[PDB]
Amino acid sequence: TATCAMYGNCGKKSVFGNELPCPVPRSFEPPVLSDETSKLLVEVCGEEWKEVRYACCTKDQVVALRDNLQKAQPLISSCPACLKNFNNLFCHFTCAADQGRFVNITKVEKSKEDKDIVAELDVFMNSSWASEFYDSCKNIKFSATNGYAMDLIGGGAKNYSQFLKFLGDAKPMLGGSPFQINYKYDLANEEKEWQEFNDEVYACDDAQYKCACSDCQESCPH
Ligand SMILES: *[C@@H]1O[C@H](CO)[C@@H](O[C@@H]2O[C@H](CO)[C@@H](O[C@@H]3O[C@H](CO[C@H]4O[C@H](CO)[C@@H](O)[C@H](O[C@H]5O[C@H](CO)[C@@H](O)[C@H](O)[C@@H]5O[C@H]5O[C@H](CO)[C@@H](O)[C@H](O)[C@@H]5O)[C@@H]4O)[C@@H](O)[C@H](O[C@H]4O[C@H](CO)[C@@H](O)[C@H](O)[C@@H]4O)[C@@H]3O)[C@H](O)[C@H]2NC(C)=O)[C@H](O)[C@H]1NC(C)=O
Ligand SMILES: *[C@@H]1O[C@H](CO)[C@@H](O[C@@H]2O[C@H](CO)[C@@H](O[C@@H]3O[C@H](CO[C@H]4O[C@H](CO)[C@@H](O)[C@H](O)[C@@H]4O)[C@@H](O)[C@H](O[C@H]4O[C@H](CO)[C@@H](O)[C@H](O)[C@@H]4O[C@H]4O[C@H](CO)[C@@H](O)[C@H](O)[C@@H]4O)[C@@H]3O)[C@H](O)[C@H]2NC(C)=O)[C@H](O)[C@H]1NC(C)=O
Ligand SMILES: *[C@@H]1O[C@H](CO)[C@@H](O[C@@H]2O[C@H](CO)[C@@H](O[C@@H]3O[C@H](CO[C@H]4O[C@H](CO)[C@@H](O)[C@H](O)[C@@H]4O)[C@@H](O)[C@H](O)[C@@H]3O)[C@H](O)[C@H]2NC(C)=O)[C@H](O)[C@H]1NC(C)=O
Ligand SMILES: CC(C)[C@@H](C)/C=C/[C@@H](C)[C@H]1CC[C@H]2C3=CC=C4C[C@@H](O)CC[C@]4(C)[C@H]3CC[C@]12C
Ligand SMILES: [Zn+2]
Ligand SMILES: [Zn+2]
Ligand SMILES: [Zn+2]
Ligand SMILES: [Zn+2]
Ligand SMILES: [Zn+2]
Numbered sequence: 480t481a482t483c484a485m486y487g488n489c490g491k492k493s494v495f496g497n498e499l500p501c502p503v504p505r506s507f508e509p510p511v512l513s514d515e516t517s518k519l520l521v522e523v524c525g526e527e528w529k530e531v532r533y534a535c536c537t538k539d540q541v542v543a544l545r546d547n548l549q550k551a552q553p554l555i556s557s558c559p560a561c562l563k564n565f566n567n568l569f570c571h572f573t574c575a576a577d578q579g580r581f582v583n584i585t586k587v588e589k590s591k592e593d594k595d596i597v598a599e600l601d602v603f604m605n606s607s608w609a610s611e612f613y614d615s616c617k618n619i620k621f622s623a624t625n626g627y628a629m630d631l632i633g634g635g636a637k638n639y640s641q642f643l644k645f646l647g648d649a650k651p652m653l654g655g656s657p658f659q660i661n662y663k664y665d666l667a668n669e670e671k672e673w674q675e676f677n678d679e680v681y682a683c684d685d686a687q688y689k690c691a692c693s694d695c696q697e698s699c700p701h
Contacts, residue, residue: 482579483535490590499596502584524570536574544573554628558690560681561616581676599659603666605677613639615683619694
């Protein structure tokens with residue numbers, strides 16, 4: 480029930496670097512998740528991945544996803560709505576069974592193992608989801624001092640497109656993306672073989688994942 484843009488890794492771009500994913504054709508179907516990879520996926524991405532058997536990610540990909548999400552978690556953990564939206568984006572990007580329909584590989588290069596690895600890709604993104612995602616993180620204050628968390632996870636982004644641009648720009652060694660990820664908002668409606676990323680999104684004043692008024696303006700008494 481899966482279609483992927485990439486699956487597993489095909490070597491390093493340079494020494495001291497990390498593994499980079501292998502592009503796969505659209506007709507590729509991944510195997511069933513191992514017991515170990517499934518339990519790890521539930522710990523990293525939440526209980527919504529329990530009954531998932533086919534995923535577009537291997538165990539090494541889930542581990543790399545875990546190590547990077549844990550570095551960014553303390554910056555936004557005070558606001559559950561932002562943390563939920565933040566984790567949900569990169570979890571679907573890495574492992575969703577429909578990853579091949581909203582992620583488009585645009586550039587590759589050869590690794591040290593002499594195999595094709597991802598150099599640049601596009602993520603077709605629903606504007607409304609990205610806008611609400613930015614709205615749930617923009618007002619988070621970092622408990623140390625009184626600066627905005629958006630200065631670190633978003634580089635001081637003022638709108639959602641600059642936010643996603645900061646997340647997707649290739650920033651290896653700086654805990655960022657190992658390759659260039661471009662978020663596209665102009666996917667034509669005539670394209671039926673592609674779709675935009677879209678999911679449940681949680682506002683910072685949502686009842687289930689409410690954030691403090693110091694981190695959310697709509698959570699303050701009006
Ligand atoms: C998902 O991701 C994939 C992969 O990234 C995307 O696939 C690409 O889609 C585009 C269209 O959306 C395709 O462009 C069309 O390509 C054909 C074939 O192009 C070759 O031959 C023509 C001659 O027939 C050459 O002119 C081309 O060289 C350059 O053309 C233009 C002119 O400047 C330039 O912008 C291109 O970047 C291209 O540069 C490439 O040339 C070298 C030399 O070979 C190449 O090695 C290198 O890759 C350079 O990037 C090219 O050699 C072409 O005929 C079409 O031309 C007509 O279309 C446009 C409108 O679309 C008109 O403006 C134009 O005047 C022509 O009338 C297109 O250029 C592209 O090939 C394709 N990539 C593939 C198949 O690998 C998907 O689009 C993505 N899906 C999304 C976003 O939904
Ligand atoms: C979130 O906030 C960001 C930051 O403000 C914002 O990004 C900016 O968006 C605007 C609008 O899309 C961009 O403005 C365009 O800029 C290009 C060139 O930009 C370069 O140079 C600046 C210099 O500071 C750099 O910062 C930037 O990164 C780029 O390197 C211009 O060419 C554009 O002018 C055309 O605009 C229209 C589109 O074509 C035309 O109608 C218009 O007539 C202009 O045409 C001219 O250019 C054509 C192309 O060459 C040419 O054919 C024509 O003859 C004519 O000369 C436009 O001004 C701006 O660059 C973005 N900046 C950054 C840093 O991203 C986001 O839009 C915002 N997002 C949301 C959702 O709110
Ligand atoms: C990007 O994300 C957006 C937010 O999730 C997406 O917007 C959603 O788009 C769908 C499809 O266009 C809408 O569903 C339609 O809603 C209308 C209106 O429904 C209301 O009115 C009718 C009576 O007129 C009533 O019967 C309903 O119960 C509602 O009260 C319906 O008429 C349609 O049949 C269809 O259900 C969503 O409502 C809309 N949601 C939001 C929050 O805007 C957008 O589609 C996404 N774009 C892409 C390209 O993925
Ligand atoms: C807080 C700052 C540093 C911003 C940029 C956050 C970055 C993290 C959370 C995000 C940005 C891009 C994401 C990312 C890019 C691409 C891949 C390759 C894939 O095969 C495994 C997931 C992985 C490795 C993920 C992990 C999480 C990353 C690295
Ligand atoms: Zn590996
Ligand atoms: Zn989800
Ligand atoms: Zn859109
Ligand atoms: Zn580019
Ligand atoms: Zn098409």
